[PDB]
């Protein structure tokens, strides 16, 4: 839940 659609911004 912390990044299920946000890993390319949080690289
Ligand atoms: C949400 O984005 C999923 C990935 C983030 C890491 C979850 C870590 C906790 C897993 C164990 C839960 C009991």
Short mmCIF file of C-alpha atoms and ligand atoms in Angstrom, two decimals:
data_model
loop_
_atom_site.label_atom_id
_atom_site.label_comp_id
_atom_site.label_asym_id
_atom_site.label_seq_id
_atom_site.Cartn_x
_atom_site.Cartn_y
_atom_site.Cartn_z
CA UNK A 1 0.00 0.00 0.00
CA UNK A 2 2.89 2.59 0.46
CA UNK A 3 3.86 2.47 -3.33
CA UNK A 4 1.61 -0.03 -5.42
CA UNK A 5 1.57 2.53 -8.37
CA UNK A 6 4.67 4.78 -7.36
CA UNK A 7 8.24 3.21 -7.88
CA UNK A 8 9.55 5.19 -11.02
CA UNK A 9 9.12 8.58 -9.16
CA UNK A 10 10.48 6.87 -5.88
CA UNK A 11 13.55 5.56 -7.89
C1 LIG B 1 1.88 -1.54 -1.18
O1 LIG B 1 2.25 -0.66 -1.94
C2 LIG B 1 2.51 -2.94 -1.18
C3 LIG B 1 4.06 -2.96 -1.18
C4 LIG B 1 4.74 -2.26 0.02
C5 LIG B 1 5.45 -3.14 1.05
C6 LIG B 1 4.52 -3.90 2.02
C7 LIG B 1 5.29 -4.42 3.25
C8 LIG B 1 4.46 -5.24 4.26
C9 LIG B 1 4.16 -6.68 3.80
C10 LIG B 1 3.69 -7.62 4.93
C11 LIG B 1 2.28 -7.33 5.47
C12 LIG B 1 1.88 -8.30 6.59
#
